[PDB]
Amino acid sequence: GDRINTVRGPITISEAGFTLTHEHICGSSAGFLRAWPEFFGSRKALAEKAVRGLRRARAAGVRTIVDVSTFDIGRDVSLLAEVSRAADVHIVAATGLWFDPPLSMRLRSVEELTQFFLREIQYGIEDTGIRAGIIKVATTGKATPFQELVLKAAARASLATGVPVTTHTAASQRDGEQQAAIFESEGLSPSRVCIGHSDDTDDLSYLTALAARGYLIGLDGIPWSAIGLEDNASASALLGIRSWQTRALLIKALIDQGYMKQILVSNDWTFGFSSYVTNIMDVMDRVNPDGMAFIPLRVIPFLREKGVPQETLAGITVTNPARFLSPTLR
Amino acid sequence: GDRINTVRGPITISEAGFTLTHEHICGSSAGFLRAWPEFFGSRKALAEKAVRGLRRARAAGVRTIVDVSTFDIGRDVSLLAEVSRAADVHIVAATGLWFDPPLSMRLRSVEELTQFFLREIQYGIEDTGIRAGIIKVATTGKATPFQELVLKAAARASLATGVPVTTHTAASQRDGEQQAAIFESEGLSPSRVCIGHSDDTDDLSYLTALAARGYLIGLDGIPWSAIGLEDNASASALLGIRSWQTRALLIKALIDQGYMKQILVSNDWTFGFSSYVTNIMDVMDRVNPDGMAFIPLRVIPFLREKGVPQETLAGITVTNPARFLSPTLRA
Numbered sequence A: 001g002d003r004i005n006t007v008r009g010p011i012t013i014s015e016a017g018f019t020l021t022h023e024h025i026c027g028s029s030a031g032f033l034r035a036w037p038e039f040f041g042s043r044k045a046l047a048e049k050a051v052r053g054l055r056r057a058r059a060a061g062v063r064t065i066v067d068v069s070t071f072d073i074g075r076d077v078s079l080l081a082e083v084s085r086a087a088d089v090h091i092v093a094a095t096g097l098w099f100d101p102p103l104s105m106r107l108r109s110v111e112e113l114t115q116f117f118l119r120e121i122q123y124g125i126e127d128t129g130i131r132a133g134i135i136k137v138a139t140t141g142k143a144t145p146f147q148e149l150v151l152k153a154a155a156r157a158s159l160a161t162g163v164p165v166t167t168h169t170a171a172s173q174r175d176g177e178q179q180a181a182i183f184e185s186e187g188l189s190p191s192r193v194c195i196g197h198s199d200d201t202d203d204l205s206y207l208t209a210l211a212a213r214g215y216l217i218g219l220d221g222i223p224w225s226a227i228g229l230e231d232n233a234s235a236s237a238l239l240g241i242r243s244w245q246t247r248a249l250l251i252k253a254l255i256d257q258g259y260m261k262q263i264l265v266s267n268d269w270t271f272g273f274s275s276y277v278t279n280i281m282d283v284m285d286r287v288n289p290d291g292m293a294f295i296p297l298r299v300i301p302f303l304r305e306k307g308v309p310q311e312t313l314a315g316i317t318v319t320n321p322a323r324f325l326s327p328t329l330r
Numbered sequence B: 001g002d003r004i005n006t007v008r009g010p011i012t013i014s015e016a017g018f019t020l021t022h023e024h025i026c027g028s029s030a031g032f033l034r035a036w037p038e039f040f041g042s043r044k045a046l047a048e049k050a051v052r053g054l055r056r057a058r059a060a061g062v063r064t065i066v067d068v069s070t071f072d073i074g075r076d077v078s079l080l081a082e083v084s085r086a087a088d089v090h091i092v093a094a095t096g097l098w099f100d101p102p103l104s105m106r107l108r109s110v111e112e113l114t115q116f117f118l119r120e121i122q123y124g125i126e127d128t129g130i131r132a133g134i135i136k137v138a139t140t141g142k143a144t145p146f147q148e149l150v151l152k153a154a155a156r157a158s159l160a161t162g163v164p165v166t167t168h169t170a171a172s173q174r175d176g177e178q179q180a181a182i183f184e185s186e187g188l189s190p191s192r193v194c195i196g197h198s199d200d201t202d203d204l205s206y207l208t209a210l211a212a213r214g215y216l217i218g219l220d221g222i223p224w225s226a227i228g229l230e231d232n233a234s235a236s237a238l239l240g241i242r243s244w245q246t247r248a249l250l251i252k253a254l255i256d257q258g259y260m261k262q263i264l265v266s267n268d269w270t271f272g273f274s275s276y277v278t279n280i281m282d283v284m285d286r287v288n289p290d291g292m293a294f295i296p297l298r299v300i301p302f303l304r305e306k307g308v309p310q311e312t313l314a315g316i317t318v319t320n321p322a323r324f325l326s327p328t329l330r331a
């Protein structure tokens, strides 16, 4: 409760400092990295790529990252522990389920799913003893019956442990609204939930509505933009055509309405990516060579240049995260 | 074509002995066993059960089993090795893809998949050095565009290595026919292919047509029957309501038509099963307490009893498999 679980062990809340709330070391699939490492060059190579990128973000002031990769995202905790130790960056691991669960998970009940999330948070991931510090869930527009179950089990495990919940949404379709509804029906406080991929929409009306309820708003894909890369149909589809400035501005808008306390910013960056078109990383790395350092290097100066007080900026990147991540029982 | 790859290393063809061609140590999902072993009691309990069952099969004469679990079936090669060693039964591992691929697989090209299968056969599984001795693929009725790629990649890897291909079909939909077409278009010889779940249809005309063309016919789920358990929907939907005898008789029927050399028999058994309803294992263990010994203990005697010469029985359980498994390069 006074401590947060990292892949290197528990840390005190003051030890977190500047935290990136939605990132990935690798975006893959369960067992993929162990079965076909060469798809990323090799395991060592992906590891070195990640350490370099984490060292650079650390130089920009980043002290902690929350890796929101779930079992189905192909999360490899041993890999997380190893790059964390090498780059000297704290990494918070996650439990929960994304939108590519295999049959062994899709056929489970809410009760069984609750047990699995609890196992990861209390006993540890696999046989490592490494505990999860957050629960990641997802909807892809209108919730499927299984997705519904996932949300309910995420909510029950949160209640029992104090651990927060972070989500993936189809912003455009106001997914946030349905998720809020389910979480509330389980008795979970909005304050323990972050509504993700929210910078993906321009609808300030949707956003302030959730903020007004106590939810945290995840503006985590700032550098995502295919402007110029309109050549590429795949990239255009994933990245979008809104510029990074446009996304960054959403931050200002919310602050302007009195919501600085409910904002969480991130890059939604990764060093490896197999669950997409081949070579999509190359494309991404071209669009954003700063990688995870983008927020500190480009978004912060930028917002300051627009009237946002530095002190306000420190609250969003240091204060908001600490409050969110500290394990809080009802 | 001298040696076959097992989880304990290469064996000579004469060492294979009585072989079960379509089995599983565990039926799961990639990464599941390592992430939630308690689902099976424990990984230790699972190993123990599996060792017991294999010793029982061994007591009955079984010397080798082919575990057709692919990556997406959650195949755990280290688990296989340990149980092989403890029970002293040879186990042949597989590469290929079944019907639950994750995004990282589903977005791959034919060229990309070829490389993954070759990796498993030549380089080995994961970092173990353990090499696959068969390629498993599947269709669930009419092939999806992804499935078609998988079949092409499997045909190409077989062509380069000489390792056989074994399939999963929706028998009632005559899936073997579309699979044959694809394989044939790739230049693959039918004798390198086993059309699985073939005991799931009563349509002998579909089976004889494939047999006539040179394909091997996998009558692999003999003990699967929901007979007397129709009070259970999930069970019945999976095991079917045709009796074990009905299935076994398809064996004699193909023999009677002159295709003994094209027949492969198995139990399609397992010691763990997470890719289905919870508790499915209990139901199965109720239905067939003999586990993988069912073939030797009940099917052989039954068949002998229906007039099949012992000699023919030996050909099917020893001979046919040795020929199918021998890595065979195209002339």
Ligand SMILES: CCOP(=O)(Cc1ccc(C)cc1)OCC
Binding pocket: A115, A118, A119, A122, A123, B038
């Ligand atoms: C075997 C898996 O442990 P468990 O059942 C009970 C358990 C939880 C935490 C610790 C430290 C030990 C044991 O997990 C709780 C959901």
Ligand SMILES: CCOP(=O)(Cc1ccc(C)cc1)OCC
Binding pocket: A038, B115, B118, B119, B122, B123
């Ligand atoms: C996994 C990297 O090995 P490779 O590229 C080439 C390779 C094949 C066999 C052996 C023994 C070593 C290396 O695998 C073939 C597809």
Ligand SMILES: [Zn+2]
Binding pocket: A168, A169, A197
């Ligand atoms: Zn997402």
Ligand SMILES: [Zn+2]
Binding pocket: A196, A197, A198, A200, A220, A221, A268
């Ligand atoms: Zn996002």
Ligand SMILES: [Zn+2]
Binding pocket: A022, A023, A024, A068, A268
């Ligand atoms: Zn993400």
Ligand SMILES: [Zn+2]
Binding pocket: B168, B169, B197
């Ligand atoms: Zn099958």
Ligand SMILES: [Zn+2]
Binding pocket: B196, B197, B198, B220, B221, B268
């Ligand atoms: Zn079968």
Ligand SMILES: [Zn+2]
Binding pocket: B022, B023, B024, B068, B268
């Ligand atoms: Zn099978």
